[PDB]
């Protein structure tokens, strides 16, 4: 058991099939049999009742609190975690071959592996020459109109490829000690906005490695309803195989 | 179960009996995530084997033994069965998967034989956790004795064969050779080293860096120019991947070339090898048993174009990337092992005294 | 006059900076044309002045690039032609017969025309050298043979292409690192339908046990039958000798140089270390000596046969051919 | 295409070579017994330049005398060399303003300094520059030449270290700055506003100080009178991208060599590279300058020996040694990684390591010189040991029975020299 | 101690002089055994140190390889005896008796070699030898006693004319022998059918250490496809691995312009070795040395 599937939800079935089904279906075809889902409870903790009518192999649902972050909800189910965690979100609708990411976590003994896609507050992504090792993680909120790179980083890696328009899939392969540190330091609220930039910064100061797989085929429809139609426009395209 | 890896490209007719894979192609794309048929440690080990993340024979053996220790730690016995049989039967698919990822080296073969002998020797009355701890301790002791103490003894033996003001020629990358040279320089010997490298791996560069970091003067050149530099060379120190029962030295391709040119230039040839790399099999040439690497590695960018790009378009064109070669015992003057300084013909004798 | 001087300077600078005529036959043709222009345009009275002028020009061209022996060979051939014409028009080798049985100041009006027509005949014979060498391919290649080559030799390519028109065989090509020109030879031979294999020089020994004969080109042929070939050819010759594999050198007659292997430290051509160790290595380049010799010396005892436009010969006969092409007094030049 | 021209600046307007440069201009300093301007002229001629303009202000008389005696001033040279001298020159901007005023350059000239050692062929770079000029209506004005290198190489001196941000698709220079004494590098996001793709930060580039420019570059230098160096022009052009963009591109070479001798460390690194044949075919035995006094023969372990050397008995030349014509070496000597000029006299039991001896240097027996530089006709007495990074300038005589410190610079000029001396270090 | 350096050297020289037939190594081993007999010690560490010092002194007396080989063999014998018996008092008697038996066996070794080697000489053969060797003399004596007829060529052995001594000793038993120069080995090689030489020391890889003219003789025999046979006793097996001629220790070359006294012959130039262990290939010496030292 090198991975435990974990699903974040803090969702309404906007589509032909329920939105949560597609990540569940992807995990099922990729080989998973035990899945952990954290359901929203701000409005009503009835998502477990809704999913109790599904025909998936095995699901373990847990209601969340009134308000919690992604990292906080990860901390919520710590006793249920024993190995490296595959953290996903219900909004993921993609036909990715997960071995394109998991292998990055396998071959290099990565501390964290993530999935991102080419696009149609921007995020600055700095990778190496091979295009796999993530060197820089930035958002315009924390920058005073000046992007700063340490001299030692360029000493070790004298070529940095910068991507401005890229969409994260919120698909993460995380080591156990990452979750242990997450519980040790309660300051972190969301893995997407603080934990990953913190790990990328700690990559250059017991070795820490961050890897990212960049895709150019399909991505997940964002939380806003504006892209909700677009996923449907592709849903029938992807429903034939899946 | 585990699918069969597909052969890549067209092979030379003389080498049609050997597998030939593609580096980009991996076996894990058709395997379940998380891994169930194959233990995750073995999956990761095979992934780094096929991509060439670990390459040295000693490094490959150490990584294999670490993965095996992890498997033994995670292993549990099934009801109405014995560990001595269940573990042996369970390890075989993992080794088949590893072989599919990349053909096993001689050191890994010997390690597998030793571990199988150790597991078979485990008594039925032994407790599960006692047996697992004993197996892990045996693996650690095997690593210690067969690698670290052997390298230290070989370095001490080779110190006596290195004198002040001599020129030593080395080939490729070998941890034993680098350690020997580093300790020889440390104890006070003053000399210079000539490093020989070959395409496409260019492993010798590694050794060069080590020498540069040790303060030892060093020179660098490719294998075709070796005949130019041997007139000033006094001794040739070669690492070995395996020693065969007939005294032949199985090593990186180009080693027998250097031995032949050194003999043509009247330069003695010294081979250092740990006794755990000795093999009972025999081999007269490099055709019967060898490894076929990725042919696309032979492509080189000369000028502004790659001449070998899309080489599969030509039906009659073939690309051969041999990994190993065999040096006959008549081209080797001395073998340095942890047992001492012996002739090549004494290789079977060691095989007789190690077994019993 | 001025145009001839510009041509000579351009040739010297091209030789010094490399490049120019890729083909050895093209370089020989250009050298012969330059020598013909020197003879025609420059003013001379007797044979001695012409010989001294040719000697000075050949010395300059040889000093421009000592590794290019074709220019010096052409200069010595022209000098021998001049000597033969002067002896034929004026009068009527060292040996025991000459030792036992016991002046170029004279001027003749028709000597220049004889020299020019002899040079033209030499050029005409030079044009058909490759076809003459390739016409002997069938006498040396049998059915289902295995041939081993190194680098990219145009003469060997013509040899194999002519042989493939009527026989089926396999050719193994070793990439002459660092300038892996063997890839071009392999793809060219594969385009002609020949089944070819690409391998590195490190495998030359390993596959040598399955090779029937070795056919290689050369840059220079020395007076004793030794070779100045591409680097790695000495190892190939040693491997062939270990297995008693016949080694055939397909080399035109204009690559014979009356020099001897006594010369040292100028034989091999040393180029920038970037070809062997890239500049991006960094700090370790400060304390590492990197040498990249382009050419290699092959002793005559490792060569089985020489195939030239005049046929096949043993190395032990090379001296006689060298006696028929060059006067012993022009070796120093 | 029109004939290719080149603008050669024979004046180093900085002052990094004092006190050595007081007597001899930096452009005429002997690196491997050959002046730097000779290397620059050979590089320009080899790459196809047919017209070279030489601008010299400081000590221009010696430069003119040396150039008129050189190979490139012969009528048979394909690269015609013109000498323009003015005492009002103060920077490269002044030279370019003069070029614009006199309209010397017609189209697509080459800009380089007089202390540049290179074997680069810019034919591909020139073709790319001309094609991008034709396609993009002469918007682009400058293409710089960089060598793919590593930050840890000796040729990557700290003073001239540079970090660049470019567009990978079109090789367009977006940001350019120097890393002199900086542990952090700041990149504005305005370049990211140009496009969401293509931005790449490069720190593996060595500044060959070679550029393919346009007459518009000279016009811009004339318009902005505050422009003094090339860095000022590049930074001003890059910051003012809103109006009259005038994009700057770049070209990277990986198989050829290019460097600039701007200080003693760079001088040592470039000399080591030249001796080790890294600038082939520009090698000591090639004799790219047609002079009989600089001929030599190459031998194993990179040993270059000139005519009439007569090495003494028991002396050993280990590796990377160049010997000038007429140099005399004593007995039981040990010379390694050193260049010795013509007409030198060396005593017995003297150990030279990584030293550079110019013509006329006499060294007494028993000396130990390491990583030091000796100028013309310098003298060293008996029992003298020179610590690394020592300089002796213009006939300095050093007394016996002393040991110089590491950073010892001695010259006949009192103020600039740290230890002014005439016949000894003790006053 | 009980025996001093002076009287140690005196005993060695007297034992050599009393029986000129006995080899230097046998005399050295006998002297070491006599030293062990009168030691008056009680610790196996002091006994080992004293024996090592005695071996150093004996090797200082004469610079032969065989003496050092015998010293190392004696040291290994002492180590094995100490391993067998922990108590020193019980160990000393075992060492003494085992040394007596060892002396008897190394005395019978020469006759064993002669009996096992005389069969390789044919009727009407031409045997080529290099210099004086008691083992070769005994081999030829045993061949003559077998009613075999053969001719012998010997070389004069220029540094000290022991070849003339060998020729006289062979004439003593009416053997047709000839004396040739050291420069005539290649000239006379085509006449000889096989080569028999002695050995002062057998190195680890199967090669031999012998008089200065042995190596060129073996090379000339190899160039003409002639068998090269070596007769050597077992106590001359030494764990030395000379890579070339310069690799031979200097304590054996000299004191026994420049004139080395010994040379090394590679195992590839040797057909068979005749020892008291039997007829062996050069590869068997390494096996013997490995088996001896665990």
Residue numbers in the entry:
A (entry chain E): 1 to 10, 27 to 136, 154 to 238, 259 to 295
B (entry chain G): 166 to 521
C (entry chain D): 8 to 99, 106 to 115, 121 to 351
D (entry chain I): 40 to 466
E (entry chain A): -1 to 254, 268 to 305
What does the paper say about this structure?
After the recognition, eIF2 is released from the ribosomes as the guanosine disphosphate (GDP)-bound form and regenerated by its specific guanine nucleotide exchange factor, eIF2B, a heterodecameric complex of two copies each of the α-, β-, γ-, δ-, and ε-subunits. Various stressors such as viral infection lead to the suppression of cap-dependent translation and the activation of the integrated stress response (ISR), since the stress-induced phosphorylated eukaryotic translation initiation factor 2 [eIF2(αP)] tightly binds to eIF2B to prevent it from exchanging guanine nucleotide molecules on its substrate, unphosphorylated eIF2. Sandfly fever Sicilian virus (SFSV) evades this cap-dependent translation suppression through the interaction between its nonstructural protein NSs and host eIF2B.
The N-terminal region of SFSV NSs contains a β-sheet, followed by a helical core. The interaction of SFSV NSs with eIF2B is mediated by the N-terminal β-sheet region. The interactions mediated by the eIF2B subunits other than the α-subunit are limited to those mediated by eIF2Bδ R321, which interacts with T35 and H36 of SFSV NSs.
